[PDB]
RNA sequence: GUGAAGAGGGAAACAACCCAGACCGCCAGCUAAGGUCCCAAAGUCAUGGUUAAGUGGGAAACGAUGUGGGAAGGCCCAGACAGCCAGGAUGUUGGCUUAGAAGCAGCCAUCAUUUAAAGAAAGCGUAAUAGCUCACUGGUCGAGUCGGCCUGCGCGGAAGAU
RNA sequence: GCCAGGCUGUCUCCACCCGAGACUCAGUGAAAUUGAACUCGCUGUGAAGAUGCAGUGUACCCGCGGCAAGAACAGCUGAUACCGCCCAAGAGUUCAUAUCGACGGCGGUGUUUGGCAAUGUCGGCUCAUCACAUCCUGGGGCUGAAGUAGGUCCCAAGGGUAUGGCUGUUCGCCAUUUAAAGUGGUACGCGAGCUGGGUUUAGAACGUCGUGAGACAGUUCGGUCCCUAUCUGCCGUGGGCGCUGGAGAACUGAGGGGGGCUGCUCCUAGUACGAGA
RNA sequence: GCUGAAAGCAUCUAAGCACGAAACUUGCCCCGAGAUGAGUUCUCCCUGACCCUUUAAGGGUCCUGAAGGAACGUUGAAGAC
C-alpha cells in the first residue's frame, strides 16, 4: 500500500537510492495506489555520473508492497518494505536490467510483458 | 419467482477445485409449508403465506393455534408473504424445499442488521440515531452450493443479521 | 371551403356508413373506419358525399374540406387501395425482410428490426433504392419512420444505397 | 437559431407559421433564416 | 383633508386611497363607496360588441402579416388570385482580360426572325457542358383575389420574486 | 541565529480498550429569564424577513436522548456603472447576423462611482437550501459540419462541479488532475455553531489632534466572542386514546427516505467506406 | 417522418398517421392505514341472573374473569430509560 508522500525503495541498477512520491495517478480523486498502478516520484540521492540526475520528476511503478496483496486462495504476499522502479512516459523499457528481490504474478499486464523475464528469483 | 425464509448460522470459506477461496454464508432453510393463499377475488392480490420453525403449544397464542389448525399444519415461529409473478400457483400445506434455488444462480437476501447504540453524526452520516433493526436488502448474490438433503444454502459475501437471525432469500429480480 | 364544396363520387363496390359522427368505409381492400369531427354534418347523398358544415362552428368549412379530401381518398382506396399511398424501402445495407420483421444493419453494430404493424405487401424488386405500393392501406401508418430514424442514407456519404427502387440525395464524405 | 423579438421575411422563401402560439419563420432554401420568437 | 385627537365599512391585510363624523338599547327598514360562483350576502340577470390567449389576474418605448369594421386602391364571367396536362425552339461555344464562363462572376450592348409567345436572361448544379424551373403565351374548371392605413383587443416587446 | 537526520494517530481514516460525567433507581437541590399564551411551514403587506394581520397547506394529546438550523457594518432617487434586447453599416473567398459585428434606440439592476439625509460588520471550517440566467454528464437546431474534435443557439438542476505557493482576503496569478473544478439569492447564508487572520465591543501599544478627559477607514499584540436554547423546528423512541364486542398475526397501500457517477482496455475493428489522408 | 393536397409542383399535419434523449416518470431498494378517508384477510374468546329509575347510546346488585396483555425471574449478538 502506497499513499501521498510515501518512502519507496529502489529495485534497479539505475543508481537511485532514495525516491520520494509527489503525486498519485490512476483514478480521479484517488487517495491510494496499488502495486499495479502508476505513481509520480522524484529522486533524493543520485550516483556521481549516470543517466539519472537530481531533481528529475518521472513516473514509476511499485513492485513490492509492505502491506501486500491478497490471493484467490487466501494467501498473502508481504515484504519488509516498499520497492518501486522508475518508469518513463516514453521508452517504457526501464534502464535497469536487474531487479533486486522477487516479484509477484500480477505483472502480466500488456505493458509489463518485458519485465517478467527479469527477476530470476521468482 | 418466490423466495423462502431461512435462519442465518454462520459464514466461512469454500475452496474450489482450482484453488480459489470464496466466502459462503450458511443459511438453514427448513421446508416452509404454505398456510394460507391470497387471491385477487378475495384478498385483492395473489400471494402465499409460508411458515417455518416450531413453537411450543404452551407458547402459542390460541388464535395462532386455531389459524394453524385450519391449515392442518404444525405451528411455526412466524409467517411471511411472497408475491407471485403471475406463474404457477400453490396449495395450502405444500411444503417448499431449497430445490427451487438449485437452478437460479442469482439470489437476493433481506434481513435485519445487528442492532447498535446511538451513532454520532460523524459515525452515521460521515442525524445521529439508533442504527440496526431495520429491513435491508442486498441483491445480486450468487448461490455457491445447495444441499437439498440437509436444508443448507450458501451464498457469496455477507448477509444482514447476526448468528441465528432470520432472513429471506428471493430470486434475483435484476439480471 | 373550396375543398368542402366538392361532392366526391363513390363508385360501385364501396359501402359508406354514417353513424352520426362515425364514418365507416368498406370495399375491396377491406374495412375502414374514421371518427369524423363533430363540426361537419356530411350528408350521405348516395353516389356522393356532399359536405355541409353544421351552423355554429367557425372551423366548419375547413373541417368539411378536410373530411372531403381523405374521405374521397379512402373511398377510391377501398375500391382500388390507398390511391394516395406508396412506400419507399430497400434500405441500402445488408438486410432482408420476412414475416412481419424487416431485418436491417443500418450503420450499427447490432441488427435493428422494425415491427411490421400486422400486414404488409413486402417486396424486393431491386437491391437498394426508393419504392413501394398502396395495397397495405391503413397499416402503412409511417412504417418508414423507423427505417429513416435509424439512418436516412446520411446526406453526406451515401454509405449504403437508398431503398426499394428510386433515388435519394447525398453530398461528399470524409469519415467512415 | 435566432430568438429575436421581431421576425421578418429575409428572403422570398420564408413562410410565417403560428405553432403553439409562437410565430415562427420557416425557410426551405437556407435553414439559417429560421427564427423562433415572432 | 386625513392621522395627531374619529369610531365603522370597502380596497384580501394596511396610518396618510374611497364612503362616512360613533348619546345609549332594539333579532326593524332604506342608502353612500364596494359587491351580487362559492368561500362570505346578494342576478350563474336581459340586450348590444371584444376575447381562444387564463392577456383578464403587472409592466413602458419601439417594429409586422387576426379576426369585427371604416376610408378606400389594383386586377376581375371581351372571366382575376393560386394555378400548369403544352411551349420556352435558333446563332448568343460572342467579340471582350481568347486559360471557359456560353445568362447562372464581371467590362457590355441590353439587337434581331417563327410568332397564339419567349428574354442576346431570375434560381438549383456542373472545371464551363448539359439538364429542371420562372417571366409570358395555348386549353379546362372558376368566380372572386392581392398589397398598405386606421384601429379596441389576441401578439411581440415580456424576463420577477424560496 | 540556520541546516540534515531519527523521532508520535496532527492528518489520508481513524480502529479498539480502563476510569470520571453523560442515562435509570432512592433522597438533597438554585439561578440567569418571565405581561399573558390553546407558542406550525409558505406567499403577500407591515417602523421594511411576522408563531399573533389576509390567503394557503400540514399536523392525534404528553414525554425522553440528541446535532444547535433559529458617525462606524447592515431609508428615498438612479446621472454614473453593469446586464439583456431591437435596428444595423461591415468583416467573413460572393452573403449582415455559421462566427463577430461599428453608429444608433430600448428596457431591468441596485452588483461601482453617485444625489437627499446591544441588529456583533470581511474571511476560513462544519452544515446546507433554491432559479438556470448550464461548467460538465449532455441531446437537439445552424455551421464557413467533404469528421471525433468542435464554432454558435432551445431544453435539461436528475446528479457531479479539486489539490498546493502569494492575500486576512472576496477576487486574481501560478503548477498538477479531472467531466467540469459554474453564475447568483439565502442580513454580499451560516459567530446564543467553530478561530479570529485586518478591520469594527471592552485593554493596552506607536505617530498625529487638543492644556485637559478623549478621537483618528493613520498601524501592530492578543481579544470573556456575553445571553440553563426558556422556547421554535427536525432524527430516533415511548405513555394515553380512537378506529365501535375484545384480542393475536399476515399484508394491499394514499403518502413519504435517500442513490440513478465514471476512467482504461478488449473482441467488434485498422470496421462504413473513403481518390487518398 | 409513408402518401399528400388545399394551391395537377411542393410542404411535419389539414387528413389515414409511427419512431425517438440517459431530459421526465415508473421500474430498483426502505418507512408507511393517527391515511381520523382511521384499510383488507385468517383465527381465537365471551351464549349468567336479579332489582330500581328521571324508561333509555339508563343505573345498581350477586356470580363469572374467557382469549390476550401486563406484573415478576433468567436473560440476548435488543437496549440511555
* C170 in any annotated domain: no
Q: Is the CB of D37 under 7 A from strand E?
A: yes
Our CA angle for C87, C147, D27, nearest 5°, is 80
Q: Specify the CATH number for the domain of residue C127.
A: 3.90.930.12
Strand partners, A19: A8, A43
Cell of B9: 448460522
Q: Which of residues 61-100 of C touch strand G (CB under 7 A)?
A: 62, 65-66, 69-70, 73-74, 84-88
Cell of A41: 516520484
Cell of A122: 521468482
Alpha helices for C89-141 (secondary structure H): none
Q: What is the DSSP string of B14-80?
A: EE-TT--EEEEEEEE----EEEEEE-TTTTSS-EEEEEES---GGGS-HHHHHHHHHHTS---SEEE
Residue that terminates a domain, selected from C65, C80, C95: C80
All residues at 6 or more sequence positions from B110 whose CB lies less than 8 Å from its CB, including other chains: B135, B136, B137, B138, B160, B167, B168, B169, B170
Q: Give the H or E element holding residue D17.
A: strand D14-19
Same domain, C18 and C73: yes
For chain A, which domains are there? 1-122 (2.40.150.20)
* C29 in any annotated domain: yes
Contact C75, C47 (CB under 8 A): no
Q: Give the H or E element holding residue B124.
A: helix B121-124
Same domain, C119 and C153: yes
Cell numbers 442469482 correspond to: B106
Tell me how many domains chain C contains: 2
Q: Give the H or E element holding residue B121.
A: helix B121-124
Contacts of A74 in chain B (CB under 8 A): 13, 21
Same domain, C67 and C124: no
d(CA A66, CA A84): 11
Q: Do B15 and A73 touch (CB under 8 A)?
A: yes
The set of strand G positions with any atom below 7 Å of a protein CB reads 1-7, 10-12, 14-21, 28-31, 40-45, 67-69, 77-80
Same domain, C75 and C111: no
Same domain, C74 and C90: no
The residue among B72, B85, B95 whose CA lies nearest residue B4 is: B95
d(CA C54, CA B83): 56
* C167 in any annotated domain: no
Considering all nucleic acid strands, name the nucleotide whose C1' atom is nearest to the C-alpha of residue C36: G15
d(CA A94, CA A117): 13
Same domain, C102 and C74: no
Same domain, C115 and C90: yes
Backbone angles phi, psi at A15, to 5 degrees: 100, -15
b (16+ CB within 10 A) / e for A2-18: beeebebbbbbebbbee
How many Cβ atoms from other residues are within 10 Å of residue B62's Cβ?
A: 7
Residue that terminates a domain, selected from C37, C53, C80: C80
Same domain, C52 and C96: no
Same domain, C23 and C48: yes
Q: Give the H or E element holding residue B123.
A: helix B121-124
C13 is in which domain, residue-wise?
Answer: 8-80
Alpha helices for chain C (secondary structure H): 60-80, 144-150
Contact A79, A1 (CB under 8 A): no
Our CA angle for C66, C67, C71, nearest 5°, is 125
Q: Is the CB of B115 under 7 A from strand G?
A: yes
Is residue C56 packed enough to be buried (19+ CB in 10 Å), middle (13-18) or exposed (0-12)?
Answer: exposed
Alpha helices for chain A (secondary structure H): none
d(CA C130, CA C167): 5
* C50 in any annotated domain: yes
DSSP state of B163: T
The residue among B9, B23, B29 whose CA lies nearest residue B165 is: B9
All residues at 6 or more sequence positions from B90 whose CB lies less than 8 Å from its CB, including other chains: B34, B37, B48, B96
DSSP state of C54: P
Gap positions in chain B, given as the residue before each gap (C–N > 2.5 A)?
126
All residues at 6 or more sequence positions from C6 whose CB lies less than 8 Å from its CB, including other chains: C51, C65, C68
* C74 in any annotated domain: yes
* C66 in any annotated domain: yes
b (16+ CB within 10 A) / e for B108-131: bbbbbbeeeeeeeeeeeeeeeeee
Same domain, C48 and C17: yes
Contact C61, C4 (CB under 8 A): yes
* C35 in any annotated domain: yes
Q: Give the H or E element holding residue B122.
A: helix B121-124
Cell of A2: 502506497
Resolution to 1 decimal, in Å?
A: 4.5
Amino acid at each position: 500500500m502506497i499513499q501521498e508522500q510515501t518512502m519507496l525503495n529502489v529495485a534497479d541498477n539505475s543508481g537511485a537510492r532514495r525516491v520520494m512520491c509527489i503525486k498519485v495517478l490512476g483514478g480521479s480523486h484517488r487517495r491510494y495506489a496499488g502495486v499495479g498502478d502508476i505513481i509520480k516520484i522524484t529522486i533524493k540521492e543520485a550516483i556521481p555520473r549516470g543517466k539519472v540526475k537530481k531533481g528529475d520528476v518521472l513516473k514509476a511503478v511499485v513492485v513490492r508492497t509492505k502491506k501486500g496483496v491478497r490471493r484467490p486462495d487466501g494467501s498473502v504476499i508481504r515484504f519488509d518494505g516498499n520497492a518501486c522502479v522508475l518508469l518513463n512516459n516514453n521508452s517504457e523499457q526501464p534502464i535497469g536490467t536487474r531487479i533486486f528481490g522477487p516479484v509477484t504474478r500480477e505483472l502480466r499486464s500488456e505493458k509489463f510483458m518485458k519485465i517478467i523475464s527479469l527477476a530470476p528469483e521468482v | 419467482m418466490i423466495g423462502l425464509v431461512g435462519k442465518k448460522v454462520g459464514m466461512t470459506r469454500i475452496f474450489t477445485e482450482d484453488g480459489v477461496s470464496i466466502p459462503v454464508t450458511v443459511i438453514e432453510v427448513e421446508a416452509n409449508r404454505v398456510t394460507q393463499v391470497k387471491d385477487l377475488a378475495n384478498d385483492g392480490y395473489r400471494a402465499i403465506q409460508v411458515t417455518t420453525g416450531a413453537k411450543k403449544a404452551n407458547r402459542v397464542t390460541k388464535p395462532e393455534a386455531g389459524h394453524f389448525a385450519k391449515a392442518g399444519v404444525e405451528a411455526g415461529r412466524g409467517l411471511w408473504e411472497f408475491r407471485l409473478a403471475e406463474g404457477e400457483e400453490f396449495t395450502v400445506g405444500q411444503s417448499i424445499s431449497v430445490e427451487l434455488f438449485a437452478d437460479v444462480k442469482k439470489v437476493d437476501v433481506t434481513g435485519t442488521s445487528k442492532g447498535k447504540g446511538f451513532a454520532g453524526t460523524v459515525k452515521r452520516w460521515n442525524m445521529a440515531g439508533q442504527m440496526g433493526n431495520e429491513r435491508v436488502t442486498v441483491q445480486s448474490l450468487d448461490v455457491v452450493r445447495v444441499d437439498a438433503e440437509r436444508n443448507l444454502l450458501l451464498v457469496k459475501g455477507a448477509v444482514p443479521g447476526a448468528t441465528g437471525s432470520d432472513l429471506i432469500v428471493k430470486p434475483a429480480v435484476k439480471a | 371551403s373550396r375543398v368542402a364544396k366538392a361532392p366526391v363520387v363513390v363508385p360501385a363496390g364501396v359501402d359508406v356508413k354514417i353513424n352520426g359522427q362515425v364514418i365507416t368505409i368498406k370495399g375491396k381492400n377491406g374495412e375502414l373506419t374514421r371518427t369524423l369531427n363533430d363540426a361537419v354534418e356530411v350528408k350521405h347523398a348516395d353516389n356522393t358525399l356532399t359536405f355541409g358544415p353544421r351552423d355554429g362552428y367557425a372551423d366548419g368549412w375547413a373541417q368539411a374540406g378536410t373530411a372531403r379530401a381523405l374521405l374521397n381518398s379512402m373511398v377510391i382506396g377501398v375500391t382500388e387501395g390507398f390511391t394516395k399511398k406508396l412506400q419507399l424501402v430497400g434500405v441500402g445495407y445488408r438486410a432482408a425482410v420476412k414475416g412481419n420483421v424487416i431485418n436491417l444493419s443500418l450503420g450499427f453494430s447490432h441488427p435493428v428490426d422494425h415491427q411490421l404493424p400486422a400486414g404488409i405487401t413486402a417486396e424486393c424488386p431491386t437491391q437498394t433504392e426508393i419504392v413501394l405500393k398502396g395495397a397495405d392501406k391503413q397499416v402503412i401508418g409511417q412504417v418508414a419512420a423507423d427505417l429513416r430514424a435509424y439512418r436516412r442514407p446520411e446526406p453526406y456519404k451515401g454509405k449504403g444505397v437508398r431503398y426499394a427502387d428510386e433515388v435519394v440525395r447525398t453530398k461528399e464524405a470524409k469519415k467512415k | 437559431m435566432k430568438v429575436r423579438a421581431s421576425v421578418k421575411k429575409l428572403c422570398r422563401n420564408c413562410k410565417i407559421v403560428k405553432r403553439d402560439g409562437v410565430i415562427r419563420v420557416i425557410c426551405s432554401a437556407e435553414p439559417k433564416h429560421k427564427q423562433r420568437q415572432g
